[PDB]
Amino acid sequence: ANPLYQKHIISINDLSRDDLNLVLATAAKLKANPQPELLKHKVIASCFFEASTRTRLSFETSMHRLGASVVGFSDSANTSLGKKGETLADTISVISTYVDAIVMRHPQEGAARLATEFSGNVPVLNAGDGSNQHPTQTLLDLFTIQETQGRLDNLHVAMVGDLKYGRTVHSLTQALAKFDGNRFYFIAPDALAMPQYILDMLDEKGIAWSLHSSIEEVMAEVDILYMTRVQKERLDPSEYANVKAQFVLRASDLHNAKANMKVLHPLPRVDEIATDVDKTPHAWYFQQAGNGIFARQALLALVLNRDLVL
Amino acid sequence: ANPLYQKHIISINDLSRDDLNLVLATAAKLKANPQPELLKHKVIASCFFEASTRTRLSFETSMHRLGASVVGFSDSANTSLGKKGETLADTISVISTYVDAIVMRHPQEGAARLATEFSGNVPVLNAGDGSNQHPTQTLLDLFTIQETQGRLDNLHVAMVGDLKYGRTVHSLTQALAKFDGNRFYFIAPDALAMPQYILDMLDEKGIAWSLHSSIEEVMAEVDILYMTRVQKERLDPSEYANVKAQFVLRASDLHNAKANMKVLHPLPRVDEIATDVDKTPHAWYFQQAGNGIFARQALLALVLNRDLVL
Amino acid sequence: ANPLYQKHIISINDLSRDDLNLVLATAAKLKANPQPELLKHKVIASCFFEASTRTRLSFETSMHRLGASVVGFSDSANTSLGKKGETLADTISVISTYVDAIVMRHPQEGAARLATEFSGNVPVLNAGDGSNQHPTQTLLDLFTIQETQGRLDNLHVAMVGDLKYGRTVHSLTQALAKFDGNRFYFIAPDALAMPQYILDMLDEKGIAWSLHSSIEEVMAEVDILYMTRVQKERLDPSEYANVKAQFVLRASDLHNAKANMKVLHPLPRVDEIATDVDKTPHAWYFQQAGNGIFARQALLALVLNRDLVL
Amino acid sequence: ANPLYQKHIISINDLSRDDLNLVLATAAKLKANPQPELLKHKVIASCFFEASTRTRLSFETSMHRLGASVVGFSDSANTSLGKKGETLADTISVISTYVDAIVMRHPQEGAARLATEFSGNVPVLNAGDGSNQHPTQTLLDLFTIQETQGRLDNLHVAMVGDLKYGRTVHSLTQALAKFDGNRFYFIAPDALAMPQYILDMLDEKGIAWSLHSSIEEVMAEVDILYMTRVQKERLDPSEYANVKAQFVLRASDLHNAKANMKVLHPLPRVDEIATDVDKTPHAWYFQQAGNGIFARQALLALVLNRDLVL
Amino acid sequence: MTHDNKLQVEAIKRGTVIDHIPAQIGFKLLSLFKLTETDQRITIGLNLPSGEMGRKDLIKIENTFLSEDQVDQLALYAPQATVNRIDNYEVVGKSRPSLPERIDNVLVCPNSNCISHAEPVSSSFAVRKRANDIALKCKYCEKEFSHNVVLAN
Amino acid sequence: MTHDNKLQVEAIKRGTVIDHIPAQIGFKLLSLFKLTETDQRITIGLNLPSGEMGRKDLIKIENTFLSEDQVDQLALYAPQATVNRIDNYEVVGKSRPSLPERIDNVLVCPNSNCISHAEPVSSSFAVRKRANDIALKCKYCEKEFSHNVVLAN
Ligand SMILES: Nc1ccn([C@@H]2O[C@H](COP(=O)(O)OP(=O)(O)OP(=O)(O)O)[C@@H](O)[C@H]2O)c(=O)n1
Ligand SMILES: Nc1ccn([C@@H]2O[C@H](COP(=O)(O)OP(=O)(O)OP(=O)(O)O)[C@@H](O)[C@H]2O)c(=O)n1
Ligand SMILES: [Zn+2]
Ligand SMILES: [Zn+2]
């Protein structure tokens, strides 16, 4: 069957470079030649125990552009399951008798991995688990990097913002470190810098990285600028408003950027990216959210279909 | 293509008499000869940032009787998007990469019009925006008036209740003033009367109107009686309970009504219409809510299909 | 024994001119020589079933400046009474079993008067019952007119703002009509006009009033300018802002005000009186709030004392 | 008249060494012979716009032990002020119209200082303004150091915990730098380090400090060990637990503590000081809280009294 | 180059001169229409002793010709003004403002539930009914207000 | 005479001339310090040629003697601006801005939780040149920021 046929998609750590390439290869075919009746008669459950409108809607629109049905929920301060006394294990054990696949986002880390031990042979796909993993975000980021730059190796990638707690930036660095020659520039407030584990990993593979202080410092060499949002709560309002002449992106700062340089942001972007960046050629955060559809179509198609010729 | 093919449906002001007739002509064909696989493979987003169960369900049942898929939400004190810091413009910009059309109801006026500038060429349909517009209500009212009376011109239409703030009664008067010869009777508590703008418009076109004090005063000449609900909060409990021997409708009051006179109410009808009116021939508020299906099927079909032969 | 001894102060319509003057002459003495132990050993209940901080803190402070102990609750933050199904008659029959007077605010009109049927002869003083009465706010307003103008008769009093729902403008008009030769100027938007029952009472007593739509039509003649807040809930967003929001006093409008003219406002003032008015000698809204201390002290003193030697 | 007579106690940076010693010598006398009627007939407002039970109950009890009456609110449970749109300037201009001093806690920094522009000459005592100051907690800590150590100079003071966001460690460091020859040992995880502006002030005054990462590096030399609580919100779940949660004092670590060494903690302590420490003679956190009574009594006495005979 | 003086300052080589600005509207105009973000030499005379208004304001912007639609955005604030266009020390053009059909960006919808407050859109008002007194309708909320009301705030 | 500079010079009789306003601060200064809120003659020149110091701005305010404290305020914006009083057709005092003790009114606290944002208060900051920068401490929140963080916002 394909390598991922009914396999669980829980951590990017668990997927080899070849699996990442298979997903990104499929997503480019589904983007080119749609197959709207591919999962006809499958019912997927969209169990968002934690609410995320943009992630839930990208996923359910993936399910529906391949023809599947959707049952599910989002529990912001509401809706019965888990409850208290109702284990996650018993929720899964019961829902895996109803559906053909489970996409779930949950607030405690490893919830998706616990699910895997109770879903029978129903596959579970992680849409976010606490501060651990969010593999379908990384898959769409890499699809956006591959589709704009033409390759996933030998890139000068700048990562900016809360590097300490952006889950997406920890994942993207693992992933990009399965390909070759990538150079990393990490621009963070030192209260919010890369954990030494990402950094220690990167040196065992020999990957080059540098820490900088402002994007103006690397603007000129950079292919992908990946901005992350800075979490107001983890900072005092007065240090948050104090950091240099900031680390926000304005079109003035881009006047130096390479012609193929692209600004990606997992979104929301409250103020780290101004409105004028939106109209430069380098703005790519909204096209990046449209590629979410193609990345998650690819994962669902490969998981639920044995062989897929497209 | 048809006149409305991928056009935005934001204000009744923006649709000519001919467009209103095209919609009402289509809705009568969709009511006669169903086409359940007309929007097959389209995904519509039902973004109710403001909850309205009856409007949301009429719309999603429209989407589904034409075969479309639905992703969406209703945010009563819950669900992530807009948030604070997350602009409506960025919600639309992101969702218009996922779907083929956006139906949305929002609490601030003009939200649907702002959406139009961010949805790309994805059409947006207004399901309510603050106290400004609700075009799909007016379309179903006119379909109900056309289907019961046989015409939309030369009608004696009585409007009753909170004329000052019923958004539906402001819209219905614009709309009915695009056809000819209509006479209007406005029965309101003077704390809650027609704005002078509806009235000033009506006189520039030469349309006849009179203000009355009780339905008993016009019962005999009237073809459509359109009751609106009276908003308890905008009144003191003691003036609310004091108004004459009321302006509520009972079957006793109908003993005079013309045989083809019809009582319409956008609903809910807490107490302005008693239970006994429900069984007279003149009660038409529930059939009026069933015509909602046919009106919104017509708008969706025309917007998303180029040419439609039915 | 003084006339108010052990009376319930429930409504302004129950207090005669003589009653009004006796309270105001006592307030003037307590303001002049304190009597900090007059209510020694008395315990008073401050039951605010509806929260009102401003009013509660004045009432309790003036209980404390005469030596009384205070027990009680501010609720509208579920502090346990009304649970199980305790009628107000029962709550008041248990609280009158151990306090010497009840001060009480409640959301429904008539609640203080009912308390009066269950309190034995523990006096009930009303601090607000829904949209009905508030005697203690009219007593302090009157005291502030008297003390700054030297009289309560032959006044030219303008009332500006929402005259339809402001329960304090209604009561101060009823109180001032107890006195002679006062002239009223009402300046209200059309939707917030002074009700008929007030106007009709003024006519029947031969008192002069007129409607004006600008304060500067009347500035020159005016002694007390009593401003009210328009609650924007009572209008819509656009109505409030449209022409109607010019019931706002700026310092420049006071150009030609009589040297004795005073601006009064029960408070919160949000924007109907601009900040620059405060520096003028005519601003008396805060000194008016300070006078709530002597009018509330006087009522407690007169009600709990047989004979008051002054 | 004493120097503090009718002063606003807003910040520790405004009180001189002499001011600090005068308060502490008064606290020592009131602790020794009570003066339970010194503030007889004074009424004080205890406005806690942000709830803080511990602090409110100390402030009110010490108002009660000098004979003052208290009126006021604990909010952060919607008790009506701030509704309509009452600015804090206006709330304080009405409350200063009838109380003799305002004690006040508020969520925003600077709020007590602003109250000072509107209170006339009713003293404002700050009980916490956001992350800025808390003078009365530093006055009681100082009093407890003085009273147990016999001096406020030549001390070896260790500060352990979250030194970055603990507003009390920042202030006690500024107060102790008013005095001579004190030595500071800071023991903080890397993310919770003592800010530069503190460190820079210490350097500029020639005062000695050092960073250590274990309490047992310094136990032997230490006189006051001032522990703070790490709020786990400030870190992630795993960070808090990983190596960093060893800022926890157990009884065994006190093995070689000087006989005079005292452990202080503003409280709540949740787990940074283990329960078995309480039986040691060095545990002084609760006796420290008892001393908040005499330091708050002294400030009220010195501020409301011209001449204090002791 | 020609003999300036300041009571009515003189001649720029080519550019625009907006003269007979009411008084205290000149700086309002510089603020609102961001006329200041040019590297060109701008000369401005404020509260000046002349044409009948008595005092009046004046702005001279060398090397920029703003016109037709720009001159018309000036009509709500300075309708009496003349907008001289100069080439080679001579007034080759003398224009006046007339009411436009649209006023973008400069106004603020007085309706507080309007969505335009919070978002990266420009304000826009449809204009109507010349000199008996102007109504402006928001593009977004479609509420029609009185110009003096939007113009207050 | 001509090596153009002046051309029919707006020589004023009595007033203050603020010269060398270092380009683009010229308009800031008017708005911020509300210098047009007067009825006397102002003549403003923007982006003047001043080959000798690049490009500059210059405000001339008649019969007005903006001073001492008022002059020191401008130090944060136009640190090299020379004010010149004039009592009778020439310079009778040329004064440079010195960094002041406090900067009131004009400036905003970066601290979003600082109470100065929602309230009827005039901002105030204590000024301190920590040679390299100037730190500004808010009166209210007592937080201290790089003058550059404040002057962005
Ligand atoms: N090269 C020139 C020529 C004229 N002006 C300005 O052009 C304005 C008006 O042009 P003009 O028709 O020459 O004088 P008027 O006849 O007074 O124009 P109007 O009657 O419209 O005021 C004057 O204010 C003058 O400052 C100028 O600055 N530069
Ligand atoms: N009758 C006068 C005299 C002087 N000024 C102005 O006052 C300023 C004073 O500069 P000045 O001492 O006359 O010679 P400068 O070299 O220009 O002074 P600086 O060193 O500041 O460049 C000049 O801009 C000039 O326009 C004026 O308007 N009217
Ligand atoms: Zn609007
Ligand atoms: Zn501040």
Side-chain angles (χ1 to χ4, degrees), chain B residues 94-126:
Chain B
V94 179
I95 279 175
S96 52
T97 63
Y98 313 158
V99 300
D100 303 308
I102 298 180
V103 167
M104 61 177 290
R105 190 187 243 229
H106 189 114
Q108 288 173 269
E109 295 80 53
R113 183 141 257 132
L114 185 131
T116 275
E117 317 190 332
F118 292 101
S119 55
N121 34 16
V122 171
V124 327
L125 296 111
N126 192 12

Side-chain angles (χ1 to χ4, degrees), chain B residues 10-11 50 105-111 126-135 162-171 174 195 197-198 234, chain C residues 235-239, chain E residues 111-115 140-143 145:
Chain B
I10 289 149
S11 163
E50 176 189 269
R105 190 187 243 229
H106 189 114
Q108 288 173 269
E109 295 80 53
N126 192 12
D129 63 333
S131 56
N132 169 33
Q133 290 297 314
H134 194 5
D162 178 2
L163 302 198
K164 191 177 176 198
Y165 307 104
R167 105 235 262 209
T168 50
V169 307
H170 303 163
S171 295
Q174 245 91 275
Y197 82 85
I198 296 292
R234 306 205 177 102
Chain C
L235 302 178
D236 88 90
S238 320
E239 205 197 327
Chain E
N111 168 24
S112 49
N113 204 22
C114 191
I115 193 78
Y140 292 96
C141 71
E142 300 164 61
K143 298 285 167 170
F145 301 101

Side-chain angles (χ1 to χ4, degrees), chain A residues 81-248:
Chain A
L81 258 284
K83 175 179 197 49
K84 165 87 130 208
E86 224 320 284
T87 46
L88 179 55
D90 282 7
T91 302
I92 302 307
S93 305
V94 179
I95 279 175
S96 52
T97 63
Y98 313 158
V99 300
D100 303 308
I102 298 180
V103 167
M104 61 177 290
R105 190 187 243 229
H106 189 114
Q108 288 173 269
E109 295 80 53
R113 183 141 257 132
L114 185 131
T116 275
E117 317 190 332
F118 292 101
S119 55
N121 34 16
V122 171
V124 327
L125 296 111
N126 192 12
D129 63 333
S131 56
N132 169 33
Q133 290 297 314
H134 194 5
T136 49
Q137 182 69 41
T138 308
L139 292 173
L140 69 89
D141 295 346
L142 293 170
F143 189 53
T144 301
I145 295 165
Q146 199 168 240
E147 151 175 300
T148 51
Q149 310 307 302
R151 67 189 121 120
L152 285 196
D153 319 92
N154 299 316
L155 284 163
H156 291 126
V157 171
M159 250 145 56
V160 193
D162 178 2
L163 302 198
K164 191 177 176 198
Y165 307 104
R167 105 235 262 209
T168 50
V169 307
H170 303 163
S171 295
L172 207 69
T173 310
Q174 245 91 275
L176 274 171
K178 288 161 175 57
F179 296 88
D180 299 276
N182 283 327
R183 195 206 189 121
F184 285 106
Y185 305 94
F186 298 130
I187 295 158
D190 61 303
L192 302 177
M194 263 301 168
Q196 191 89 342
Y197 82 85
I198 296 292
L199 300 178
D200 281 338
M201 178 266 285
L202 290 190
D203 281 329
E204 281 184 75
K205 316 298 195 73
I207 291 137
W209 60 276
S210 355
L211 305 182
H212 297 270
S213 342
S214 70
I215 296 111
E216 145 262 310
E217 233 162 82
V218 292
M219 186 50 96
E221 298 204 66
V222 164
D223 299 306
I224 294 301
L225 214 223
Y226 190 83
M227 306 268 334
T228 338
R229 40 165 283 96
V230 167
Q231 282 280 101
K232 343 257 163 282
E233 311 88 76
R234 306 205 177 102
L235 239 43
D236 194 58
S238 352
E239 66 171 289
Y240 180 188
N242 211 0
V243 281
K244 193 211 207 295
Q246 286 280 24
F247 307 157
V248 299

Side-chain angles (χ1 to χ4, degrees), chain E residues 55-145:
Chain E
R55 307 186 223 127
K56 52 99 199 273
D57 290 345
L58 193 182
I59 285 170
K60 300 185 200 319
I61 304 161
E62 306 185 6
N63 281 228
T64 296
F65 277 100
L66 53 68
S67 254
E68 240 65 75
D69 294 82
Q70 261 167 309
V71 171
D72 273 41
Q73 296 293 256
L74 312 181
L76 242 176
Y77 306 90
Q80 239 65 49
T82 312
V83 174
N84 298 295
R85 146 183 293 256
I86 279 98
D87 228 17
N88 206 239
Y89 296 98
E90 283 280 74
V91 179
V92 74
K94 197 157 165 182
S95 209
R96 317 232 323 117
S98 176
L99 254 312
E101 50 183 73
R102 234 179 75 152
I103 295 185
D104 288 81
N105 304 284
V106 146
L107 289 152
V108 173
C109 184
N111 168 24
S112 49
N113 204 22
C114 191
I115 193 78
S116 59
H117 286 131
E119 305 269 321
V121 297
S122 297
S123 53
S124 192
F125 284 86
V127 193
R128 56 140 128 149
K129 201 175 194 167
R130 281 264 302 156
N132 61 50
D133 282 0
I134 325 285
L136 307 167
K137 177 173 175 205
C138 182
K139 178 181 175 180
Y140 292 96
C141 71
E142 300 164 61
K143 298 285 167 170
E144 190 165 67
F145 301 101

Side-chain angles (χ1 to χ4, degrees), chain E residues 1-2 4-7 9 24 27 30-31 36 38-49 55, chain F residues 4-5 7 10 12 24 27 30-31 36 38-49 55 62:
Chain E
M1 63 293 133
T2 230
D4 281 66
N5 88 79
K6 74 150 301 165
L7 28 154
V9 198
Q24 307 280 314
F27 178 78
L30 279 330
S31 300
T36 31
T38 318
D39 286 305
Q40 263 41 47
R41 276 201 181 216
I42 302 161
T43 306
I44 312 171
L46 261 81
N47 294 297
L48 284 185
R55 307 186 223 127
Chain F
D4 235 293
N5 47 187
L7 211 58
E10 292 49 274
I12 47 165
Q24 257 61 49
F27 203 65
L30 294 169
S31 345
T36 72
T38 182
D39 274 344
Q40 271 70 18
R41 267 185 251 186
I42 300 148
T43 31
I44 299 141
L46 281 97
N47 298 319
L48 301 199
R55 235 197 268 115
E62 239 176 47

Side-chain angles (χ1 to χ4, degrees), chain B residues 245-310:
Chain B
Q246 286 280 24
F247 307 157
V248 299
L249 170 73
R250 273 151 31 141
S252 334
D253 314 327
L254 303 180
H255 83 283
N256 216 28
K258 205 154 162 170
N260 56 48
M261 187 292 275
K262 242 52 157 143
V263 179
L264 302 190
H265 193 305
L267 284 167
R269 108 292 155 138
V270 294
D271 65 89
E272 43 284 343
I273 300 185
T275 279
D276 52 20
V277 185
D278 299 13
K279 280 166 204 73
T280 70
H282 303 93
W284 216 260
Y285 24 100
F286 299 132
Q287 300 70 201
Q288 175 186 356
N291 294 338
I293 294 300
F294 294 121
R296 310 189 219 257
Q297 271 191 231
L299 222 52
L300 286 184
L302 303 173
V303 160
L304 294 167
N305 251 260
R306 307 208 76 150
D307 304 301
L308 178 47
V309 276
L310 57 198

Side-chain angles (χ1 to χ4, degrees), chain C residues 36-37 51-54 56-58 60-61 64-65 74-77 229 267-270 278 286 289-290 293, chain D residues 40-43 69-73 77-81 83-86 90-91 93-95 97-100:
Chain C
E37 269 178 39
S52 178
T53 311
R54 292 268 85 276
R56 201 179 123 247
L57 286 199
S58 286
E60 296 178 13
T61 297
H64 281 302
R65 307 229 96 140
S74 26
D75 167 37
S76 305
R229 62 159 297 97
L267 309 161
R269 122 257 216 158
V270 175
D278 307 351
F286 295 126
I293 293 296
Chain D
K40 208 204 316 191
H41 301 149
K42 293 288 146 178
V43 177
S69 276
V70 192
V71 282
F73 54 100
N78 232 136
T79 50
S80 304
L81 71 180
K83 314 296 269 90
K84 268 141 296 192
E86 206 165 12
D90 287 358
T91 303
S93 299
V94 180
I95 287 168
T97 253
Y98 46 83
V99 297
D100 307 309

Side-chain angles (χ1 to χ4, degrees), chain F residues 6 9-14 16-20 43 52-53 56 58-60 81-86 88-96:
Chain F
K6 58 241 310 178
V9 241
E10 292 49 274
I12 47 165
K13 194 168 89 308
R14 231 177 306 235
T16 27
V17 174
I18 305 173
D19 179 28
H20 192 285
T43 31
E52 69 153 351
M53 273 278 144
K56 66 177 171 46
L58 188 159
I59 299 164
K60 284 178 175 154
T82 48
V83 182
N84 312 275
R85 1 258 288 125
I86 288 166
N88 218 260
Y89 271 103
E90 218 82 22
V91 190
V92 91
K94 171 155 147 55
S95 326
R96 210 68 136 55

